[PDB]
Amino acid sequence: DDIKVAVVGAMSGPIAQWGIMEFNGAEQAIKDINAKGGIKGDKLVGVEYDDACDPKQAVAVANKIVNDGIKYVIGHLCSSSTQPASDIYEDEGILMISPGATAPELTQRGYQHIMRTAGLDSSQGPTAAKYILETVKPQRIAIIHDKQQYGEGLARSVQDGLKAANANVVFFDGITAGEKDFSALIARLKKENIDFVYYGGYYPEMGQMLRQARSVGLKTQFMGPEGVGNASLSNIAGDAAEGMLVTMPKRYDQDPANQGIVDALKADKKDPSGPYVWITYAAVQSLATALERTGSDEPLALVKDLKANGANTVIGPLNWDEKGDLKGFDFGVFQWHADGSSTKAK
Structure with missing residues (x-):
């Protein structure tokens, strides 16, 4: 009792x-x-x-x-x-x-x-896919991850949700986590004329990209999973972090x-x-x-x-x-x- x-x-x-x-x-x-x-x-x-x-x-x-x-x-x-x-x-x-x-x-x-x-964690892939498709509705999308189970797993998920729905994904690629210079990646979104990047990985990477993409003048919008919504993100990207889309509880x-x-x-x-x-x-x-x-x-x-x-x-x-x-x-x-x-x- x-x-x-x-x-x-x-x-x-x-x-x-x-x-x-x-x-x-x-x-x-x-x-x-x-x-x-x-x-x-x-x-x-x-x-x-x-x-x-x-x-x-x-x-x-x-x-x-x-x-x-x-x-x-x-x-x-x-x-x-x-x-x-x-x-x-x-x-x-x-x-x-x-x-x-x-x-x-x-x-x-x-x-x-x-x-x-x-x-x-995999439930986030589909939340992202649905958001990008219902409310962002960008023109040209490049999807990138960091060669890991987390980041790769969640990117493919989103790429999956994005195509089944006939969206326009320009390229799908991986980056070398630990990388300090994304000038080639960054030059590739310039040229491919990308306006929305979904990035599956962690903050360390995201912060350098954002910092890196904005100094060159990209207007590209960034999305990332919970691994990017860290406190260090702002001690790292500073301003370029502003308006980054994140998936979080x-x-x-x-x-x-x-x-x-x-x-x-x-x-x-x-x-x-x-x-x-x-x-x-x-x-x-x-x-x-x-x-x-x-x-x-x-x-x-x-x-x-x-x-x-x-x-x-x-x-x-x-x-x-x-x-x-x-x-x-x-x-x-x-x-x-x-x-x-x-x-x-x-």
Whole structure:
């Protein structure tokens, strides 16, 4: 009449400013819910554990939650401590809802008790493609990446979405990440007369390009994935960063509807801006409430109801595929500024 829920994450290595957001999000979650009557009168209590975000610690954590009778795990923060844990959870018929792991493989196995409230990086490719096609509507598009799984992966995605829709992509090329001079690339957008570049990679590269493209006078508009929306971007491109398009999680902290949680957090002296605050709250309110409110105690009856019906969340309405990934989950589009600040885009 006291439902026990495990919250696992790093409350100690160097990743702990990340675990702080999730512990924080979970806690506010059990409180709001038990405050409204809880689960049919029963109350939810959070048992908290340290992962330190370590693969050997993770595995020890999950053994100790098992042989300790908890049935619902709202965790692991890192993709590298989770995987190992998830083997153990599935094994022993224990529910596991990750509020931050994005390794596409967690779900490529057949585990029937593993879910996520976190989005996959690949969902950004399609958000970009749709934005460029619906609202930018540029004339000549060159697509570039940095020869890596991340950057190459996300560029091809966008190139895919862009052609299926018959858009005009001039060239598709790779750059040597670590490169300090893009004068050839830059001379090629001049000549190919390019007006919109989608670049999949990281900030280091993007910053030099932007800096590099603007000194030569290009009017070209740049798009990039979350790896480009870093704080260093402005300490690197300076002004050329201005108006760079980026794909980033939406700011749940700025939803009129979340203003109640935000105040609650400011009040406790906690920072309500971390995304882990929001995707972990979304986790608690789906296991517990969307579902235990289904009458079951049983881990599997629980995943069947969330996969059949959805959770209504702080993070929006959620739907899951039969593999336990979110369906229809999108990242936001943001317009960057020379100051390192960000307006959400048109």
